[PDB]
Amino acid sequence: SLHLPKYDDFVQSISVLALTMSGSELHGIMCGYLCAGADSQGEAYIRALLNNKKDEQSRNALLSMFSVFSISQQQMNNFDFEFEMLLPDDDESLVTRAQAFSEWCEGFTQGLTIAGVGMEQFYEEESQDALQHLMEFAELDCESLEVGEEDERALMEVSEYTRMAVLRLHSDLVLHE
Amino acid sequence: SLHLPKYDDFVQSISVLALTMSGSELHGIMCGYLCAGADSQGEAYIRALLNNKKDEQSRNALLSMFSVFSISQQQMNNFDFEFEMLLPDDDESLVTRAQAFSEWCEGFTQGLTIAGVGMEQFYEEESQDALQHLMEFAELDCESLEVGEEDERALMEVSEYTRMAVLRLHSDLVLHE
Ligand code: NA
Ligand code: NA
Questions:
Q1: Contact A79 B80 (CB under 8 A)
Q2: Which of A72, A129, A166, B30 has the greatest number of beta carbons closer than 10 A?
Q3: Which Gene3D superfamilies match (chains A, B) (predicted)?
Q4: What is the CATH number of the domain that holds B85?
Q5: Which domain holds residue A74?
Q6: Under an 8 Å CB criterion, which residues of A touch B?
Q7: In angstroms, what is the span from residue A160 Cα to ligand 1's centroid?
Q8: CA B71 to CA B84: how far, in whole Å?
Q9: Longest C-alpha distance within chain A, in Å?
């Protein structure tokens, strides 16, 4: 097996960068590049987040983002390894987890786009349907969600749907053209 | 990078088993099992090919078959590795190489069938069309093939179509269960 780091470890490891987005959004962005097979472009994007800074903290942040990118690259490209979305732990609040899920999708869709992939690049119709749903998940209002069984289940379902959809989109893009 | 052994070396390595089929057909079978996710079942098949012999030469034949099965498993499951079909080298006759391609396809479609995969197990229409083409390639007249560039590029094109198709078939099966 091969697993992403704990969510809060990752978040702490990039805190010094004072980024404008969540760990989850950032991971969604990485996975957008990787889904499109724009691996080298993803790496360049991560480098760019340092804005040329060269101190040891910034450097350690870079190494951590690269470790995550490489784990994701392997999970997305090897059927022997389960693909994971970097999201807060299950004991966080429903509202925290739902916002992070939405930001994950926003990052992923933006990543795809910046990597030159939209609706027309997909061979399968299942993929286009899925991209559209991810675009809706990205626009999701986390405050409507209500604590209890129903919405926990709802979040769990859309989260698992998104996880698989990313893998199917990736196969579509990679095995055509 | 990770590559299959040379056709000749593999064929020599299994000659002691006196198999009824060619190296290419056997590799097709292996890939049928792998495409279906029936890895353990394929392994038991390969082991049963020794018909319980335990002598050194038979055991080395088995090691060779397992090495090929494992290389294939990795190529089919890791997008970072190129998938290969085990086919005779270019030097050999056009008829001979067309024959081996056909036997590869026959082996492949038999492997799928044995592992419980036919038309209805595939989610995408494209996969179904591809399987149908592969069944036709298995029943292909190799004598008609005229030594020349037209039929040489004809063979190359269905060979490459088959190579890519196998990967798309696999992704269809794994990503819908
Ligand atoms: Na995987
Ligand atoms: Na591969």
A1: no
A2: B30
A3: YgfB uncharacterised protein family UPF0149, PF03695
A4: 1.20.120.740
A5: 1-177
A6: 77-80, 123-124, 126, 164, 167-168, 171, 174-175
A7: 14
A8: 9
A9: 48
